[PDB]
Design a binder for these strands. Structure first.
Lengths: 182, 134, 53, 48
RNA sequence: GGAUAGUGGCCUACCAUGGUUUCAACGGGUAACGGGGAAUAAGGGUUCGAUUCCGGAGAGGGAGCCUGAGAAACGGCUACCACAUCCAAGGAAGGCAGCAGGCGCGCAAAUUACCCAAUCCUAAUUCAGGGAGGUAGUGACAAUAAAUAACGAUACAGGGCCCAUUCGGGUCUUGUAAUUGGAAUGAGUACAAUGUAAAUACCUUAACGAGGAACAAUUGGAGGGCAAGUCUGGUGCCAGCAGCC
């Protein structure tokens, strides 16, 4: 007995669990970005639900009040640095209509896809998780990185990992040693 | 080749413990885990001190590799090293020998045993012998 | 009659060996390409599991 | 709860249905009350 | 007045007859230790809190008491009640609701492991000690992240377009194919170094480790609520399924 280490859960199961429209919508915006399960979308939906409650909390009260000004600007700054808002939408009313899609357009696999050298995003997810894509002097195996609008320029392949230069195989060395006898 | 480059950042000078306390910052590229023995060797040159007078620990190769981050102590002399360095570190460096004493459960057993015999139990060892003729 | 008759009766036809279903993400790649890309022709609502229509 | 099975029972279903419900009467280890538990699948009365 | 470290019906003696209560006294119950908090989430709430912190209580059940600054202490003593030991029958020793472990009780819970290296505590006290406490083991109670495949070539299809001279040249793309070919990585495994008190595990890495039969992902469902068959074989108010109809 020392002290309770704080854990919290990031996902949330939808209220009515069989619904043609929701199932259609979720499979679509899972098939677009090449996700593994529906909890990916439930998590992004939970994160946006936390932001929206934090937004309404700061909105309902007085305007030009230090609490609204400080916490509002902190959130907007954090979101515009993620890339979920752009330069010209920093009003704390744009944030309230933020479309989980926008967060899903900023995962590492989506960025690896959209910056080329990725060939269909299911290759981009398997690339990342196979220790290939390093942001900059730093590998990332997480296909839910949330790229932060300054690593967009520096993101590339690792110094290691062929796609890179250092490592030439693990299967190529095999084929080299097998075709060495001719 | 590798050409491993070391950087001793966040230096605090400590004249109390006769120390240079710093964060060792190693680059590995094309190898990893540069052998704390070799680290002390090539850290002896940066402070022209004897390699028995420098101590490093907790290197922890970073995720993806190519880099390690340890904490490194340099002493003014080896006599000071032995005075202030804990014995476990001194045996890792091979200067002091680890006292190979009895297992803690045997030590706790025999102190609980010696709780009973009052004083030097010689006059009790002179009964256990002389009560065998009854 | 007595317990376990219709199970002790039923002619157990065994399962057929097939190629597996590719688990995880690849299964959602299949479920996407089989519903929102190459779906069976719609009359009113799509029929997900019809026999010989 | 846990219990030791006294008897095998054939309880007759209520009126719109018709079957023998393959129950088991069981004395509770916990307190000593005798209850009647259902065996929850096809040929499981032969298993208990 | 006595006693107490001290205040006090705290106790004693002598007086008065007071004091609480339908704003719930008193009595009974609690599968009630209180609180910081916890779960659920429009707002208002409801339910819970033995359990990482704070406080109170107890060390089988009552009572008593010595030693001490501090105890009505229980890994201190004494007596009685309960239960229990060894006994050579005269005696002797007991107190795990500390750690681990065994019974029992049960729907229901772990190793008779390693260490003072960290956090601190105690001492005549830098060194000694510490089942406090940490380390490993068991561990799908919960919680976080996320493998179980990706890519082209070869043969069929379809879908936007030139004129629909019947032409289709298919010049682009969305797939289908038991056809196909190279690149990828850990899951494992192991020199090593790192980690550590010592180790294990992670982190990083020599060498090895993917080809459908695999390195094989299940669990619950397909009348309705409720996503998903009016498809085959069997049973024939039986066997059964069925939270509800």
């Amino acid at each position: 007995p020392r002290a309770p280490r704080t854990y919290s859960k990031t996902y949330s199961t939808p209220k009515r669990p069989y619904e043609s429209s929701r199932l259609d919508a979720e499979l679509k915006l899972a098939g677009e970005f090449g996700l593994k399960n529906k909890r990916e979308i439930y998590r992004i939906s939970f994160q946006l639900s936390k932001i929206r409650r934090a937004a309404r909390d700061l909105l309902t009260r007085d305007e030009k009040d230090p609490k609204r000004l400080f916490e509002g600007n902190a959130l907007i700054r954090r979101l515009v640095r993620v890339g979920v808002l752009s330069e010209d939408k920093k009003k704390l009313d744009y944030v309230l209509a933020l479309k989980v899609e926008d967060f899903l357009e900023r995962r590492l696999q989506t960025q690896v896809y959209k910056l080329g050298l990725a060939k269909s995003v299911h290759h981009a997810r398997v690339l990342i998780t196979q220790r290939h894509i390093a942001v900059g002097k730093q590998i990332v195996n997480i296909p839910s990185f949330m790229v932060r609008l300054d690593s967009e320029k520096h993101i590339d392949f690792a110094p290691t990992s062929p796609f890179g230069g250092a490592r030439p195989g693990r299967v190529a060395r095999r084929n080299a040693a097998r075709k060495a006898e001719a | 080749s590798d050409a491993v480059t070391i950087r001793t950042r966040k230096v605090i000078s400590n004249p109390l413990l006769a120390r240079k306390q710093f964060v060792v910052d190693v680059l590995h590229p094309n190898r990893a885990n540069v052998s704390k023995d070799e680290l002390r060797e090539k850290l002896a040159e940066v402070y022209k001190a004897e390699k028995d007078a420098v101590s490093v620990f907790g290197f922890r190769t970073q995720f993806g590799g190519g880099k390690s981050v340890g904490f490194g102590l340099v002493y003014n002399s080896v006599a000071e090293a032995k005075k202030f360095e804990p014995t476990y570190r001194l045996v890792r460096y091979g200067l002091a020998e680890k006292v190979e004493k009895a297992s803690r459960q045997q030590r706790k057993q025999k102190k609980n045993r010696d709780k009973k015999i009052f004083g030097t139990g010689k006059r009790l060892a002179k009964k256990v012998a002389r009560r065998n003729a009854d | 009659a007595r317990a376990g008759k219709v199970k002790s009766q039923t002619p157990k036809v065994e399962k057929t060996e097939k190629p597996k279903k590719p688990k995880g993400r690849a299964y959602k790649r299949l479920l996407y390409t089989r519903r929102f890309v190459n779906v069976t022709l719609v009359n009113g609502k799509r029929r997900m599991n019809p026999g010989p229509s | 709860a846990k219990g030791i099975v006294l008897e095998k029972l054939g309880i007759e279903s209520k009126q719109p249905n018709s079957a023998i419900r393959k129950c088991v009467r069981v004395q509770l280890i916990k307190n000593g009350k005798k209850v009647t538990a259902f065996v929850p699948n096809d040929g499981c009365l032969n298993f208990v």
